[PDB]
Amino acid sequence: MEAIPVKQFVKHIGELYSNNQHGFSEDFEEVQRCTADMNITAEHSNHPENKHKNRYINILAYDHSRVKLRPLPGSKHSDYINANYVDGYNKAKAYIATQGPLKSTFEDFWRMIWEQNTGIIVMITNLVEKGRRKCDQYWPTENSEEYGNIIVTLKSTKIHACYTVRRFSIRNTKVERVVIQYHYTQWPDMGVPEYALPVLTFVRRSSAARMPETGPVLVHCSAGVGRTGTYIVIDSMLQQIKDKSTVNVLGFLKHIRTQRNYLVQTEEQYIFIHDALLEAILGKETEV
């Protein structure tokens, strides 16, 4: 895959903006089309027994990269959750991208967290936005809550200007673990954040929280495609910049689009990614 030095990437961004953002439009159009003939299937998502497990009927999890739950007694499709492994920078399956959990999927959600050895949750949505339900509260407001065989206890809450951090411990009663939730809270009902700096800080801090060597970082918003893809791309590209002082947004995005549908869902989001990376490059840190 063809990466470009930071200095060239910065000039490339100026070019994508020019001529009424003509370059951004052709880029994203290319992204929108790039899997159209691959017949990537999602039969499980579409199976009538999993229907109520999906937040949106047209947002599916591709079969080849879906996260599978261990089967349950009783049960055939008890392995299904609307969630996919997604690659990160130099590390396959660095993330799980999933929808905002439904009440009917709370057990599954926490079971996946257990079975995957996930230690970090990144939540990029409020429970309700502009009066619309985006996600259900899958964690205890206080003290403990049991979700099937997993007992979740809220240990601490830290509220920051643009995000909140919650520390849980979770116990499997089939028979411990720390799970930390980074919840970005400052998000407009329409469009992308006006300023990238708050988002950059959230990405930096939530990303550093990833301890070796634990399971994939779970990233979700509402549908688990738009803001979720945006986060995955920014996080990955930042890591690539720190490592090699090179960037490749379009190539990386086309790649992860094979892993879950609609990752980075809108052209506005695609543009935001570049604005965010530009400000990261201008603001720091070494070898630019």
Q: Is 227 annotated as a binding residue?
A: yes
**Backbone phi, psi, residue 239, to 5°:** -60, -40
| DSSP letter (8 states) at residue 117 | T
Q: Is 223 annotated as a binding residue?
A: yes
Helices (H) and strands (E) in the chain — how many of each? Answer: 7, 13
Distance CA 3, CA 5 (A): 7
Strand residue runs (E) in 11-149: 66-68, 80-88, 91-98, 120-123, 128-129, 132-133, 144-147
Q: Is 235 annotated as a binding residue?
A: no
Q: From residue 81, how far is each of 9, 49, 67, 253 by CA, in Å? A: 37, 12, 7, 23
Task: For domain 1-288, give the CATH superfamily.
Answer: Protein tyrosine phosphatase superfamily (3.90.190.10)
Closest CA to 229 of 196, 190, 272: 272
- Give the other-Cβ count within 10 Å of 231's Cβ: 28
Distance CA 164, CA 187 (A): 13
What approach was used to elucidate this structure? X-ray
- The data reach a resolution, in angstroms, of 2.1
Distance CA 24, CA 137 (A): 36
Cα-only R_g, the chain: 19
The torsion of the CA quartet 192, 112, 93, 43, rounded to 10 degrees, works out to -90
**Could you give the 3-state DSSP secondary structure of residue 281?**
helix
Distance CA 123, CA 197 (A): 18
Q: Residue 167 in contact with residue 156, Cβ under 8 Å?
A: yes
Strand partners, 154: 168
Long-range contacts of 174-179 (CB under 8 A, 24+ apart): 174/149, 177/114, 177/119, 178/119, 179/113, 179/118, 179/119, 179/120, 179/121, 179/152
Q: Is 265 annotated as a binding residue?
A: yes
- Give the other-Cβ count within 10 Å of 58's Cβ: 9
Distance CA 287, CA 138 (A): 42
Q: Is the dihedral of CA 19, 20, 26, 28 positive or negative?
A: positive
Element (H, E) at 110: helix 106-115
Burial of 147 (0-12, 13-18, 19+ CB in 10 A): buried
Strand residue runs (E) in the chain: 4-5, 66-68, 80-88, 91-98, 120-123, 128-129, 132-133, 144-147, 150-159, 163-172, 177-184, 217-220, 246-247
Strand partners, 168: 154, 179
**Hunting for tokens 């490592």 — which residue is that?**
243
Strand partners, 218: 96, 121
Distance CA 216, CA 239 (A): 16
In the chain, where the domains are located: 1-288
Task: Just list the catalytic residues.
Answer: 221
Structure tokens of 281? Answer: 């490059």
In residues, how long is the chain? 288
Q: Residue 204 in contact with residue 81, Cβ under 8 Å?
A: no
